[PDB]
Paper text:
We report the structural basis for the role of two lacototripeptides, Val‐Pro‐Pro and Ile‐Pro‐Pro, in domain‐specific inhibition of ACE using X‐ray crystallography and kinetic analysis. The lactotripeptides have preference for nACE due to altered polar interactions distal to the catalytic zinc ion. Elucidating the mechanism of binding and domain selectivity of these peptides also provides important insights into the functional roles of ACE.
Residue numbers in the entry: 1 to 129, 135 to 608
The structure:
Amino acid sequence: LDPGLQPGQFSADEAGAQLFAQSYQSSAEQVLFQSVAASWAHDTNITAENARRQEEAALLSQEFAEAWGQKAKELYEPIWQQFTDPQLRRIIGAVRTLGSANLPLAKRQQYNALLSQMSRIYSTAKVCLTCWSLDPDLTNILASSRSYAMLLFAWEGWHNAAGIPLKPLYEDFTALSNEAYKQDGFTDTGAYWRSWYNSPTFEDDLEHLYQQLEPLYLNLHAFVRRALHRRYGDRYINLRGPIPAHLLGDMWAQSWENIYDMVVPFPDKPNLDVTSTMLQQGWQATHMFRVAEEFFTSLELSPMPPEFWEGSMLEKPADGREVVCHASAWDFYNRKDFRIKQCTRVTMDQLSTVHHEMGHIQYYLQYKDLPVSLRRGANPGFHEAIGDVLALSVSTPEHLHKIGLLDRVTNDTESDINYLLKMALEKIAFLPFGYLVDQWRWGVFSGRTPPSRYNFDWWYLRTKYQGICPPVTRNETHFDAGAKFHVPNVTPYIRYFVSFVLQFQFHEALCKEAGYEGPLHQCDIYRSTKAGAKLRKVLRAGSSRPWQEVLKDMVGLDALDAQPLLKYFQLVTQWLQEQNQQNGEVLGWPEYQWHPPLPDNYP
Ligand SMILES: *[C@@H]1O[C@H](CO[C@@H]2O[C@@H](C)[C@@H](O)[C@@H](O)[C@@H]2O)[C@@H](O[C@@H]2O[C@H](CO)[C@@H](O[C@@H]3O[C@H](CO)[C@@H](O)[C@H](O)[C@@H]3O)[C@H](O)[C@H]2NC(C)=O)[C@H](O)[C@H]1NC(C)=O
Ligand SMILES: *[C@@H]1O[C@H](CO)[C@@H](O[C@@H]2O[C@H](CO)[C@@H](O)[C@H](O)[C@H]2NC(C)=O)[C@H](O)[C@H]1NC(C)=O
Ligand SMILES: *[C@@H]1O[C@H](CO[C@@H]2O[C@@H](C)[C@@H](O)[C@@H](O)[C@@H]2O)[C@@H](O)[C@H](O)[C@H]1NC(C)=O
Ligand SMILES: [Cl-]
Ligand SMILES: [Zn+2]
């Protein structure tokens, strides 16, 4: 480690730790900058040379972590917990967590290499027969093909190409991750991930939330299953069984907005998917980013700086290079450079994704003056929810009309049902998947799920919560969990279930604060400077204070709460129950063993 980057001496006491943290921050900024730079160069341009570089950068960050980790222990182990300065306790708490820096050098190299290799496999896998990539090729197939056979070919090819080669790597990564975190005193990596919520009853709190949400999901599911039965017929849809996993519009069946045209109850009303209008008008990526920016400035939040426009990657490259297409937002830790990398396509759900990623940027802009350790969300769920909250105003029919995407606007109960059903396909359908992914991964890290049951345990959970089934037989050579971005890219998942709850609590608070006084689902906070100010107080806090207190100041409660999401959806909740009753549906999937047959000509 460079001499300039190494820790000095400080006293064993709180005045020293202040000097320590100032010294640390001053060093960490440079280390973070070089890591993030090398990751960027790789993620926008996957080459062996770029992976080697990113690995050398992660090694540097491990030596940094070890030297300051060990120094923070050596001087402050007995005293840090008792500091007067609350922010200074969280700073030291972060600095003393070693992670992968607990590994000896040889295993640090093996760990850094596994991260590179898993990311490469996921982002460069192809389905051939002349080869399709996930984004945009397979995405487009899953979204707009209605051919059982075609959709099967894409689903199977993807799962096979991405998952099978990842399995041995995934195994070796799990063992090394556990070895690293167990020397920080956690039972396993999953215990370390969970500890970010600082909540003794987290697992029980999530389960209580899920029990209140499950009836809405079960009713959406049955109604959608019926729509599918009418197109695909009795051979491929079982009205008492799980839904084939390839028929819901999306490679992971995790949100259903693309099959809106099959389920829309009142087709004579304004057409609420505005994608075709966007195309007709000639919208491009950069217009989408500008319209999103304008919503933020209407709240008196910050514009995107020059460095964001000059540095970002807003389309998939044409020049041949290979890239990580899954979207992400980048803080370089120098308080100057911030970027988005997104393979943006011109579609309405992609306009939402634009807002999602710009919400992360806005968080980085607001907290850029805190000590580097506090430059995070109050919890991870808060960071994921910011952009989603604004996207809830943007997609209201009235807002779409203001921005030239919807010609007529109607205010009547049929238009409301359409609206709430479209939003349910996006928000309600997701809930079971958002909850299950880390139940799977926590079982793997704890050893409850060894490599010999990775796929068995994955499909148990897929069926149990989502009520889907794989459309072809799977076995333990398949590794279907690894065909989802966040698994090989090692991004925790429970943050999204938390986010999907929190965003409705935020929405309700900012609508009240804006002075809005009609139905929660018709609220648009656009141009409300009072709403902007309340949002800004959250963003400016970073992780400097407990999330339960940040939440209470914002919404008036110190806990996650399903009530706002339930109030938003109330009208469609009631309507879907009534429809399913009148149609004699069976809620749930009692025929749990059922799978569809192969088509005659497969493949
Ligand atoms: C779309 O329409 C709804 C429904 O509006 C009501 O019903 C219609 C059949 C007609 O009778 C309307 O003339 C009538 O308002 C609109 O929601 C309603 O908005 C008003 C405010 O604009 C709400 O009234 C307020 O009530 C609070 C206390 O709750 C008072 O302090 C205020 O002074 C104010 O009068 C009314 O409750 C609300 N109805 C609800 C909640 O269902 C809706 O705003 C409109 N949407 C759009 C986008 O225009
Ligand atoms: C993608 O990454 C490679 C490095 O892996 C970049 O290639 C280097 O390009 C510079 C300038 O053209 C040369 O001096 C080097 O010799 C190249 N290295 C090689 C080929 O090993 C490439 O330019 C990157 N593409 C971008 C940034 O668009
Ligand atoms: C696992 O499955 C592999 C791929 O074949 C698939 O499984 C058969 C049984 C069909 O029903 C269909 O889904 C696919 O063709 C096999 O090649 C492999 O041998 C299977 N078993 C093991 C232990 O890997
Ligand atoms: Cl998380
Ligand atoms: Zn995100």
